[PDB]
Ligand SMILES: NC(=O)c1ccnc(-c2csc(N)n2)c1
Ligand SMILES: [Zn+2]
């Protein structure tokens with residue numbers, strides 16, 4: 001994938017059963033170069049019988065998303081509102097004030113989003129601790145992915161809500177996620193349970209330092225105050241701004257019943273088309289360890305010691321001494337992808 005374009009995968013039921021194996025396979029295809037990949041699950045697979053019984057589910061901390069800015073460069077502020085139910089949230093989402101506008105092509109809706117994001121602030125029902133998967137679902141269960149991340153909970157006992165536990169995201173028209181990479185530059189999985197689509201923007205990991213240099217130059221105040229200020233997740237930058245400053249990027253629309261995989265150091269942002277529900281968590285592969293070791297944090301921290309000892313014992317002394325000069329190649333697939341190479 002020399003173009004570093006977002007790829008789409010269609011695994012069969014047998015191919016879908018082994019999660020960590022299918023991620024290794026997609027890396028063997030170059031999926032990781034874009035920093036974002038779509039996975040369309042088998043038609044026979046379903047994580048829940050119906051979604052008609054979640055009206056009474058409580059969103060404890062909804063946020064009114066206040067956006068300030070101009071010329072494709074914005075700052076998002078979150079105002080915590082009183083706790084509301086899925087019924088109360090859906091009612092606001094489909095109301096005349098907050099409902100999705102009329103559109104023919106995605107391009108029209110994208111223009112409507114970037115033209116009106118500063119007006120009529122929407123409410124995001126984000127960071128809800130929970131899952132919508134039924135107990136018996138073994139295939140791609142966000143709550144129990146069984147990757148090497150499990151070492152943090154198995155060996156330390158430490159729980160990081162959203163990172164090694166699932167999070168539910170109730171979106172409406174114009175709700176968004178600002179430019180960011182994952183905590184500790186981890187991978188992420190996003191399943192759109194139901195509702196209107198979710199559009200995504202991505203910067204290939206190999207061009208990730210360019211977005212940072214751009215972001216730094218625009219917000220010199222925020223950059224002097226924090227080493228990794230984009231981790232605050234308040235910075236919105238339009239595709240036109242990225243096109244203007246020569247930042248390579250791609251776009252994709254996630255429809256209900258689809259998965260999105262974000263890769264280590266893959267910068268992403270996007271917005272919700274209307275009333276929807278997405279389930280999210282972080283995971284890892286042997287390849288991620290170098291990123292975790294090199295990750296520039298906000299001045300969430302996972303101890304890398306357990307990983308370095310178990311998977312890089314030869315490098316353990318060198319890394320503790322600070323003499324580990326390893327330079328990351330973003331084009332390289334995870335060692336687990338050796339069987340497909
Ligand atoms: N709102 C979303 O659907 C969404 C999509 C992608 N990433 C995140 C996210 C938030 S905080 C983090 N590390 N990732 C949230
Ligand atoms: Zn994310």
Ligand SMILES: [Zn+2]
Pocket residue numbers: 225226227228229298299
């Ligand atoms: Zn900071």
